[PDB]
Structure 1
Amino acid sequence: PLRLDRLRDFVSALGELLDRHPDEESVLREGRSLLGELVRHDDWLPEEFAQPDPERYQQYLLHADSRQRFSVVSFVWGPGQTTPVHDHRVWGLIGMLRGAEDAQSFELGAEGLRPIGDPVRLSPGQVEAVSPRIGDIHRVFNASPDQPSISIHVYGANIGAVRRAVYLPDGSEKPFISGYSNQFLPNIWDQSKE
């Protein structure tokens, strides 16, 4: 009985929102509200895009806009998995869905990477923002050693195809194109099935 209508309605609303060509602050404010409404419910994500991998965290594209104005991704960390330290180069929202993860912000200093504040500790329903304007560099990791964690991320592009960077401790940058773990997206558009 997957409530795929929730993801369909999120995608529609996010489309309508960007049709008004609003500023980043308005996108993040209205966006985090719409994402909050989606990730408050754990009755809609298909099992195929909730699956951990033993070697690396999984990046399942759920929807990309026709003009690549936004994308929606299911990120799945297994026990003890982390992202590299990375930037985005576009606005991003992180909606916590299942389990426990932490997000550490970083800044580029004289020495290299320095963490800003404590890790932000996410639990289901919580939404965080990233952007070049408000803070773009972070590392997201599973805070459980025996359970997988899932967050739904929304970006101001097709994030899997954005040329961005990972950072080493000394602040040196490697090119980063994340791509996607899935060859298949979920069909959220067969409304007659419901």
Structure 2
Amino acid sequence: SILRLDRLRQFIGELATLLDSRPDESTLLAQAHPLLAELVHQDDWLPEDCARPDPQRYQQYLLHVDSRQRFSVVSFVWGPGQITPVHDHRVWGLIGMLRGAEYSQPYAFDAGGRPHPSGARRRLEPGEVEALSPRIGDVHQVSNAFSDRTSISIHVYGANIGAVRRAVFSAEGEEKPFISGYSNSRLPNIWDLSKE
């Protein structure tokens, strides 16, 4: 229909313009917050392909990578009742819920290296944005708040996320290196303005 891809195009240039200032981390996050907020304020732009859950696993659909890999934009699609392992990120980020809701559980470790939840579980509603900086709390376990519907969140990461070597942590406290990869081997073409 009127898939409104101009808001994706707008978010992307504006994040990039912002980044062209070499802002310090915390300024960057502060100033991007409203930008992602304006992008998830309404749910009328996300291409269908980039919204399909899987029955076995969550999906990360790559929407855009910056020419200099200063950021990537990803659509995180949880099927009903799905849950990630405990893992870190290693780059700045922002998350904004588009539809459904998700839970975020922060983690820390005992001197042995076993993880344990820390602070309580945050619930993220359609519309809300929280900045992540690894300089604060990098390790977490996230999950679909709902057990019976699809939830989707739009993420922004300060790198090509599917190139970042990060870590997943078992209950027993072993660090497994992982690289997330992407669900889609093709990105949507948000760029064909030959439609008006």
Scaled by the length of structure 2, the TM-score of the pair is: 0.96
AA matched with 2:102: E
Once the two structures are aligned, what percentage of the paired residues are identical? 70
Residue range with higher mean Cα deviation, 161-170 or 52-61: 161-170
**Residue 143 in structure 1 maps to residue 151 in structure 2:** no
Per-residue deviation, 1:67 = 1.2
Tell me how far apart the structure 1 counterparts of residues 24 and 59 of structure 2 sit (CA, whole Å): 31
- Aligned residue in 1 for 2:80: 79
Residue segments in structure 2 that go unaligned for 5+ positions in a row: none
**Residue 176 in structure 1 maps to residue 189 in structure 2:** no
* Partner SS state of residue 118, structure 1: coil
Tell me how far apart the structure 1 counterparts of residues 81 and 131 of structure 2 sit (CA, whole Å): 23
Asked if structure 2 preserves the Cα contact closer than 8 Å seen for 1:88 and 1:131, the reply is no
Tell me how far apart the structure 2 counterparts of residues 108 and 91 of structure 1 sit (CA, whole Å): 21
AA matched with 1:60: Y
AA matched with 1:90: V
Residue by residue over 1:85-143, the C-alpha shift from the partner in whole angstroms, topping out at 9 and shown as x without a partner, is: 11111001111000121110111222521212111001101112222201111111111
Residue segments in structure 1 that go unaligned for 5+ positions in a row: none
AA matched with 2:75: S
- Aligned residue in 1 for 2:163: 161
AA matched with 1:142: N
- Aligned residue in 1 for 2:48: 47
Per-residue deviation, 1:32 = 1.6
AA matched with 1:140: V
- Aligned residue in 1 for 2:117: 115
Per-residue deviation, 1:170 = 3.1
Q: Which runs of 4+ in 1 moved over 3 A?
A: none
Tell me how far apart the structure 2 counterparts of residues 68 and 119 of structure 1 sit (CA, whole Å): 31
Tell me how far apart the structure 2 counterparts of residues 165 and 159 of structure 1 sit (CA, whole Å): 13
Tell me how far apart the structure 1 counterparts of residues 166 and 97 of structure 2 sit (CA, whole Å): 23
- Aligned residue in 2 for 1:99: 100
- Aligned residue in 2 for 1:68: 69
Aligned CA RMSD, in angstroms, stands at 1.1
